[model samples]
Target: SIKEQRESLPVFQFRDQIIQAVKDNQILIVVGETGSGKTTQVTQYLAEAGFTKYGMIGCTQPRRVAAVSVAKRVAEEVGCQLGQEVGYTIRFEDVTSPATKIKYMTDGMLQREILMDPDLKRYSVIMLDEAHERTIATDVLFALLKKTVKRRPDLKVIVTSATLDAEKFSEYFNSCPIFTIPPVEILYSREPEPDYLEAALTTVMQIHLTEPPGDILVFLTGQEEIDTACEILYERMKALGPSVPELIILPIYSSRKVVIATNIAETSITIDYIYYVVDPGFVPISQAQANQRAGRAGRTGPGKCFRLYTEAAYQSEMLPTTIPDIQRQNLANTILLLKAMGINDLLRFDFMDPPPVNTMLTALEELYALGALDDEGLLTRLGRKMADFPMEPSLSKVLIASVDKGCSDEMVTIVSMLNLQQIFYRPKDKQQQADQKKAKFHDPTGDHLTLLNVYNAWKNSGYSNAWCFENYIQARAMRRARDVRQQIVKIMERHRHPIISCGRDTDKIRQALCAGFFRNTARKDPGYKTLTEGTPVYLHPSSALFGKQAEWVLYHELVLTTKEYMHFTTAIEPKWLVEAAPTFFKLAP
Candidate 1:
């Protein structure tokens, strides 16, 4: 029954065609739909043809859940236990075994694998799915895979997406042969709809009323939104008679059901029964992404994509293409990672789309300022050690410098806490109480020490959830921080970096923070202006030192919304910057 069902999909129809194309070319950009079975069927079809005989058939997902679940499904379909023939590798877990041949992993995990095996010699076919997402890891993997394909012609890469970027990808992969699948259709509103949540439910009800009975995927913003839609849809869906088929609430379904999802629907996973896609977004997305959303319904046959925005808005509002992440994100960490890999000639690295020149220079300046790169721009011994940890250059710097400052233990906890972003959980009903409780943990010096103090209290409470509940601190976040702290300690120990604490010496902790963040110094200027850069900023409202100005301060991060704001600031003496970064700063006589 599984075998018969598999053959009925569009990808299975091209089974021999796909296999032979893989035989013919080193790379293939398969233009296909998400639910069209390209992700599951094509992967398994190739594996059946003994592509795994030479080595593993590695497939990557944009998300970890997709990677793990798809691997389980594929393993079940192929009639084998997981870890023997099929397995998954995610950030926190590796379920794959030595016997694993068809392995699934997130795009990021594969990038980490590159540092271990540059050529990726163990795999014969590497399927880079969701090429359209253009995340930093996938794009970085793109450049690396392009080089690897050239180095090893025997390596076959199947780049699949449900968008029209196939030609561009083929061009970047050196004129690799293209694979085609059917395209789909779109329907937009005549006028803008107010409140997209209610708008989605109205349209979904409309789709069920007139349209043929099949599954519909409604793209919403988040869980709160999804749950709201699900509840409302469930109520109205049951308020029907024999005239309409019964409806169910799965994030996907079979009984003419509805799938209410966030951006996770696109390129993350597949839903086989999707016949019509309904999307209502208050926010504007790129034309490419809009086109991508429409393509989801084309799998079994032609399907419709319904948008709650006006067609005129589509023509006037959306960008031509979304800006790639390499252009948007800070590049210091990336440059350090690349430099550690011995890629000194960054300008020459063949990016599918290169980042801006100014950004590269800024990253270089940051690394050089931190002494990760020497004056001649080679990665120094300190730089190599800094690269050992998985963190931003500034954070890793703080952790590495902690050893000499004898605050490595505190820095580990603080770094891990910062990695979790918001360790405090303020429920909507108790927002004031949460804020009041969180305020108790604030350290007068700054947010960095406040995180350390909160973490220390968490440990002292025997890592109890009740303590976390009372403090408005997130137990899950604390647990995640503990895991990260353990991993950081392992990395430190691996490099022989000492793990010690500052004990009651709080200033030593602040000094170590300055060692990493000296470049982020701001002079009060009677009003918070960053040194040299001179950007006017207020202390972030959430920061412990908010509304309190210091003559000299080192901030951990900058966020701009209503205005420029400094987050996690620490009071620093003017001389500390000059001492910590003598190469980049000078003290006035």
Candidate 2:
């Protein structure tokens, strides 16, 4: 029955044909709704068809989150435990083992793989799964990948896109053949459901009472309608009595799907085995988003997407596509990636859309001063190593410098905390108590070292979820930080970078923090002034350093909202900046 479940997927019909295509084509562009089973099933189809006989097959996603989650599902389907036959690899997050035959990973990770093995000899096939997120991480690989497959004739690449934007990729790769999966069977309002909010419950009941068994996903625009529908749906469900297959008005995680939530899931989520969707007019992102909402119903199997709006109304109002914009990462990441990829002229390199030249200059200067680049605008070995990281160049620079400072152990926790969701959970009723419980974790030196205390205490508490409740903290966020800490350790170990600690030498840790963010250090005269820009800034209330003023404080960010605010403040000695970067600073005594 576990294997039989694969029979229901839409890709199952074309299983043999899919293999035949991958076998014949050097590169194939799979144009389909992500729900068409291409994300998971296509790889299974190729592997079962014997493409992995020579080497491994890798599928890459734009974000690391999807790579892990999607690979786990495929691992279950393949009847192999994770890290054995099917696994995922992302930036410093390797769920993979040498036994891995089929892998899902981030594009950036795969690029790093190629850096390790330029020819990618161990890979028989690589698929860019759902290669349709915004162009931040995805763009760097194109130029690199284009030349790679050109030289390695034995290698096969498949790129799956949600839309015809594959036109650029198709032509870019010498017009490779594209295969698209079809039809989510859209049904629209016959007349107008005048009171659509009231009509929601009727249609919901109609599906449960009338249609065959499957989950349902409903999209309601606002909390007002969603809250009312939850109560109304609950009242009506009780009216059906206990025999009606156990109704759960979902936010999902239940068998019966009566979801009345906002449009957050429009592109970011997937719920398996949902045969129907109840979508009323909401969040007019663009035609692309509407199309992706319909895509949710079609995952695992083809299902219907019911549009409560009239067809004419959708045609008139919806924008052609999501307003295309760059994700706006630190241009340092862009320039370094491009430079490492052998791109010499960054301003002239083919960008899908170019960012401002001035912004590129800032990244150029940042990377240069950080010692990742030479004065000649070439990537140093340091820059190449920093390029391997997936965040802002500053963090990468800090992470690398951490090894020399004997604070790699502390730095990982600090960096991991930056990536984790808010970890302090203060309940409204127990606010003062939560603050008091939190007081013990605060370090007057800075919030960065305070994070070290909290993390070390959590470890000392035997990493229990209950302990998080005993003191106000987000248990899951703490667990996530733990996982990330381990990942960073694994990554650093792979580079043979030492993972030492300064122990009680807290000043050494402060020096390590400055090693990365000396430019962000601020001195108070007006409010606080970042030495680089000399902008007036105040401490954000979230920092432990808040409410107290420090003349020589090193901050994490100088965020220029309507008013400027320094986030994540840490105090430091004035000369530590000069000691950290003697050339960049003058003694001036």
Candidate 3:
């Protein structure tokens, strides 16, 4: 039954061609759609084809969830214990043994392995999945693999992508063998709907009434919207007659008739029996995203997609493909990593798609200002430490400065909090209560210190879930912050940085933070309006500094939406800027 199940997969049709192409070429690019089962099945196919005889097979995913989930699935497919023949490795998490043959890991995790072993000698076959995401680590691997294939002709490289942009990948790898799998056919809407939720509900209701027995999947923006939509469905179904097949839907239950979710359902996951899909076109999904969403349906049988936007808007307004991550994300950490890898001439470094010149220049300038790059623009000793911290270069700078200030303990908490997604929960009905709970930890000096206070209290309470409940804090984020802090502590100890904390050293912590964020400071000029980087900014409503006037302040980030705003801010004396970063202070415009 296991072999029969494997053979029934759509990807099995190309098994012979895939094996032959890898045997004939040093590199192969497989262009597969969402339902092609490339992520989980390809490793199994290679294992069955005896590729494991040469050495372990290493597969890379762009996200940790994908790496862990696919590893578990492949383990089941391979008929082995989870961490023996098949395993997964993610940041601060590894489940593997010496007998492991197929190892799934995040792209960043594999990139770290390369930092230790440039040739990746243990992995005779290296597969990079989700190539189109174009994360900096993936791009770096693309360049590294080009060199690696030449260095180790015995090694086989497989690059998988969702879109038809395999030609660019092929050309980058010297015209490597390319395999294409066409997408599934589906339907679309003809006119745009002003209210996507209403349109989605209407379509689902109509389909459930008139169509045959097939499951429905609706894509919303986030958890809040998904819950709102799910509640509406529940209420409507409860009001309907019992003859309606006793309507039931949960996010991922196989027996559930409907599923609602965010883009987390876009790829790396497949729901069986799903023949109807609803898209709320306002989510600004790329053309590739639309294809992935539509491909979710039609997996088991014929299917259709209902887009809340008009066919005209989908064709005219949407991007043909997703933008590369390097072009969209902050590149300071990326550029620093490259420098640590000794890629001195970054402007001349080969990129499958080069980031904008301005973006690269900005990264270099920021790194140099942070003392991560030296006078000749090479990575400094501090830069090496920063790269090892696995965080934003600025936060890493704060950690290194913390050791000198004897406030590494407090800095660790702040950096850990910063590494986490938002930790405070503001329920719609209890927003004022949440605000009150949050204010109890407020340090009028700034939000960074306030975060340190919150983290300290959580740790002091033995990381109790009940304590988090009483404080309106998200327990998961607190636990994650704890894990991150421990990992960072180990890195600092390995680097021999003192882990001392100055008692009541709030001033020391502030100076340490200023050392890293002096460039992020703003000053009120004449009109009580803060000006930073030549742009006007307002204090974010969530910050302790909000509504309280301050002449000088430092912020963690500047967000631009309806208006420019500074987030996670703290009041500071003008003298600290000169004291912490005298050079950048004098050079500051």
lDDT of each: 0.78, 0.76, 0.79
Q: What's the lDDT of the predicted structure labeled candidate 1?
A: 0.78
Residues 1-589, model 1: lDDT tens digits:
8788787788877888899999998888898855567878878888889888888899998677778888988888888998788889875567888888889997767766777788898998999876566665576778888888878989998988545566678788888888886556788777788788887888888888888777888876656676677788888877877677777767621156776766645546566768888867444677778776776787666788888888878778765554565532236766777787788887788877677788788778888888899998999998988877666777888888889888898888888887675688878999888889988888888888889889889999999999999898989999989988898888899888979976846777877787777778887764588885778877777888775766778887776544677877888776767776666785554
188-272 in candidate 3: lDDT tens per residue? 6666666777788878888887877888888776555666777888888878776777667775311238877765455446568
Model 2 lDDT tens row, 29-116: 8876554677888888888888889999999876677888889999989999998899998765678888888998876677567776
Worst 10 residues of 2 by lDDT: 321-330
**Candidate 1's error at 228, in angstroms?**
20
Candidate 3 wrongly placed segments (more than 4 Å): 1-5, 48-54, 79-85, 97-99, 180-290, 299-301, 306-322, 327-330, 422-435, 522-542, 557-567, 578-589
Per-model TM-score versus the true fold: 0.76, 0.75, 0.80
Give the TM-score (vs. native) of candidate 2: 0.75
lDDT of 3: 0.79
Residue 110 alpha-carbon offset, candidate 2, angstroms: 1.4
